[PDB]
Amino acid sequence: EIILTLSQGLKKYYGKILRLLQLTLEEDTEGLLEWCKRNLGLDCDDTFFQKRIEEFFITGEGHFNEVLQFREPFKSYFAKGFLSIDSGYYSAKCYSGTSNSGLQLINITRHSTRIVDTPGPKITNLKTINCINLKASIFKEHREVEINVLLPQVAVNLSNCHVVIKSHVCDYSLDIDGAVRLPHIYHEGVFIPGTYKIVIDKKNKLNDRCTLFTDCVIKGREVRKGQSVLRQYKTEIRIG
Ligand SMILES: *[C@@H]1O[C@H](CO)[C@@H](O[C@@H]2O[C@H](CO)[C@@H](O)[C@H](O)[C@H]2NC(C)=O)[C@H](O)[C@H]1NC(C)=O
Ligand SMILES: *[C@@H]1O[C@H](CO)[C@@H](O[C@@H]2O[C@H](CO)[C@@H](O)[C@H](O)[C@H]2NC(C)=O)[C@H](O)[C@H]1NC(C)=O
């Protein structure tokens, strides 16, 4: 019978958080339950973790310890606003609900009807983005670009990109193709960040061919009845 050390089980504890946040698809949790009984006197089950996540991001209000509890190895707690949720295999710098001005998550359990599709150019220039769901800022003196995503419920897919996601929920690196993963928090429904920032460094020649695929959302007023309308088309935005 092999038991985890304090730091070993903590990484797996964070590994479980990352998996539940949906920032990772893999975990190592062999030995985590015994490590919670011994070091926390608790059952480390899925219910426990979703409330740790719920409290840390939305609901908790005092100071928190490294294991995301609010007011033995972890009876000490932090005044600063973040924990480094670091499993060893992956890490994310996550800010507590306490540290922000209000709530910077949005509820995506809500129904909204599908933004109707309407034709548009397959390739969109980075410097003339007409979609409302993201906004680009270019820093030629640092040869960096930042893409602000204003509608995170609308997918942004990365291809051959190597970026840093910045947001008021968590900050983390992404290194693989596909839809940008975001922290998912359950609180009478599923919440994701209300806005996030994709930071792309051109000094790193490894994203020489970084390109973004997204649903370009167009906001309009239909002239006949005077009401606001939303439409979308698939488009690619090339960087570098
Ligand atoms: C997140 O959105 C969901 C879905 O809109 C909310 O869940 C519903 O909440 C209402 C009350 O506001 C209940 O009457 C419904 O039964 C719930 N479920 C469904 C399927 O509609 C949820 O309350 C929202 N969460 C927050 C924190 O506002
Ligand atoms: C970004 O990637 C996601 C999947 O990672 C794409 O969503 C798929 O869209 C097709 C057609 O709409 C569906 O048949 C699949 O079931 C979807 N997959 C998932 C997991 O939802 C999305 O279309 C991609 N975006 C762009 C602009 O290409």
Author numbering: 252 to 322, 341 to 509
Copy text from the publication:
Crimean-Congo hemorrhagic fever virus (CCHFV) is the causative agent of the most widespread tick-borne viral infection in humans. CCHFV encodes a secreted glycoprotein (GP38) of unknown function that is the target of a protective antibody. Nairoviruses are the only bunyaviruses that are known to encode secreted glycoproteins, such as the 38-kDa glycoprotein (GP38) that is produced by CCHFV. GP38 (GPC residues 248 to 519) does not share substantial sequence homology with other viral or cellular proteins.
Crystals of GP38 grew in 0.1 M sodium acetate (pH 5.5), 2% to 4% polyethylene glycol 400 (PEG 400), and 11% to 21% PEG 3350 and belonged to the P21 space group. In addition to the β-sandwich, the β-strand-rich core of GP38 also contains a pair of small antiparallel β-strands. The region between residues 328 and 340 is disordered, suggesting that this loop is flexible. The CCHFV GP38 fold is stabilized by four disulfide bonds between Cys287 and Cys295, Cys363 and Cys439, Cys400 and Cys485, and Cys430 and Cys479. No higher order oligomerization was detected from the crystallographic packing, consistent with the SEC data that GP38 is a monomer.
